[PDB]
Every structure is written in C-alpha cells, then in structure tokens.
C-alpha cells in the first residue's frame, strides 16, 4: 500500500526524504536507491488506477451497505451510508475538478457497483 507505503517508518525510516532530504536524519541508508530499492517492492506490487483516498472511502462505503441491503432496519446505518456517501462524493469533485477523468469515477458506478479489479 501507499497509505502504508510508510510501514517502512516502522523498520527502515524515516518519513521520508530520502525522497528529497531536508530536516534529514542519522542512520545507514543508501540514498534514493535505498528508498526506491525496496520502496518499489512495497505493496508486493504497484498501483495508480485511482485513487486510494477514495479507493478506500468507496470500499468501506461499499461493503458499508451490504448490511444496509440486508438488515434494512438499522436506519442508524442509513444515517451513515448517507455520510460515508456524501463523503465518497465530496472527494470526487477535487478530481472531477482534477485527477479523475471528467464524469465517471468522478461519478463512477457510485451507487453503485463494487469495483473493480
């Protein structure tokens, strides 16, 4: 992961430049290739499809309605599937205004389609 690109901070360091170097540090490290080295490995893989800060909101928010779909009485569940929602949308815009196409994703099968890999 990339959110968890920095579970390195755990056993490597140091948040994290290395990717630049400012208020740097004091320990081994073999520079940008020390970073990239296994920093590229990381998620046993890579990514970019789009777009983490949503590829999570939409998820928690996706399963987040399975219950809603079956329970259907936990109105104190809709009261949030509305919110996790208004959120999952509120993101879009700053991408519907930038990073994600100009309709879909920025609109996506949102409400709904468990996406996508």
């Amino acid at each position: 992961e990339q959110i968890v690109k920095y579970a390195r901070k755990g056993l490597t360091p140091s948040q994290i430049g290395v990717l630049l170097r400012d208020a740097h540090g004091v320990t081994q490290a073999r520079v940008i290739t020390g970073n990239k080295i296994m920093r590229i490995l990381k998620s046993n893989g890579l990514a970019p499809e789009i777009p983490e800060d949503l590829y999570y909101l939409i998820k928690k928010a996706v399963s987040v309605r399975k219950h809603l779909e079956r329970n259907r009485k936990d109105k104190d569940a809709k009261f949030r599937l509305i919110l996790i929602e208004s959120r999952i949308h509120r993101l879009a815009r700053y991408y519907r205004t930038v990073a994600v196409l100009p309709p879909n994703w920025k609109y996506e099968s949102a409400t709904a389609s468990a996406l996508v890999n």
């Binding site: 170097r21 400012d22 740097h24």
Partner: protein, 186 residues
Amino acid sequence: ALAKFHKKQSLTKIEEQVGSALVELQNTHPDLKTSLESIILTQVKEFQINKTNKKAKSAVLIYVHFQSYRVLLSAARKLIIELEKKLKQIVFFTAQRKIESKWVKEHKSQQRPRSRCLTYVYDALLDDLLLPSTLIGKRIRARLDGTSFYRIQLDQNDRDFLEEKLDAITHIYKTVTTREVTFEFK
C-alpha cells in the same frame, strides 16, 4: 583547486585557500578521501566577528552544493575539525539553497514547493551551523516594541564544539537572515 567548485571561474583569496585546503585533506587523510572525492563547493563567504574588545576574530562559511549535501553530513564532524586546524578560522557548512518568490510566479504550470520558501530556507542554516549536533528546543519571543528573539535550545553533551562557534553563528545569521539568535544550554 578550481576543480572543487561549480562556477569554476575565479576564486577569492578565501575561496582559493579553501580549495587547496580541501584537496589537501583527501591526499593527507585516507578516510576523507571517499567523502571529499564527492564534495563540491558552490561559493564561500567570510565574516568578521567584531566584538567590543577591538579584537578581530573571523570565521568562514562554505556553501556545499546540494548534490553533495548527503556526503557533507556524512563526515561533517571530522571535516570541520581539520579545516579549522588547517585554516585557523571558524568553519561552517551550509547547503546551497535557492529561494522561490512569493508573488512573482511566472510558470503557469509550476507550483512553488515549500522546500524552497524563505521560512524554510532561512530556518535551514540554523540546523546547518550547529551542524554536528541538532537543537532540542526552538522558540520565539516578541519584545514589546516588536523584536523577535530566537532563544534556541542546544544539547548539553555538545557544549564543546558548539560553545565556541556560538557567537559566529549568531553573527552570520544576523547577516544572512536578519534574526537575533541567542542560545541556551539545557
């Protein structure tokens, strides 16, 4: 050497001594060979520490190109020791930072990364000077009128290296930055 410089045009009496001085240490000491091989210079500035004692006590600050900033920090300790012995002057290493403008943006498709802003650049030097050891506490004070004093907290175990440069630093900062910088050991 014009070798260990980036502009490579002409040096100043100070810059010259520094050049051969550096080339000296990598030939003399086998350990600084590896690190100094790497080190390049940008420019060097000399400053006079004028105290009321009518005593002339000068020191010089050297700008290491950013490329070699990693390396510079790698052996920073030993380097400064030898440079002071070999130049009988106080030595300080900084990174060659380029500051970006606030309102003078001109490249529509270019954002000014915080990494090169005046707050962050000028705040850099302080770390650079006390170099060998980084500070513990940093603070600001507002004298009534409107002064801003930066009493900075320095580690005790470093009283050695830092106690002496202490006055130079203050004075270099007041020159580059514009900030009064008193220190306090804790």
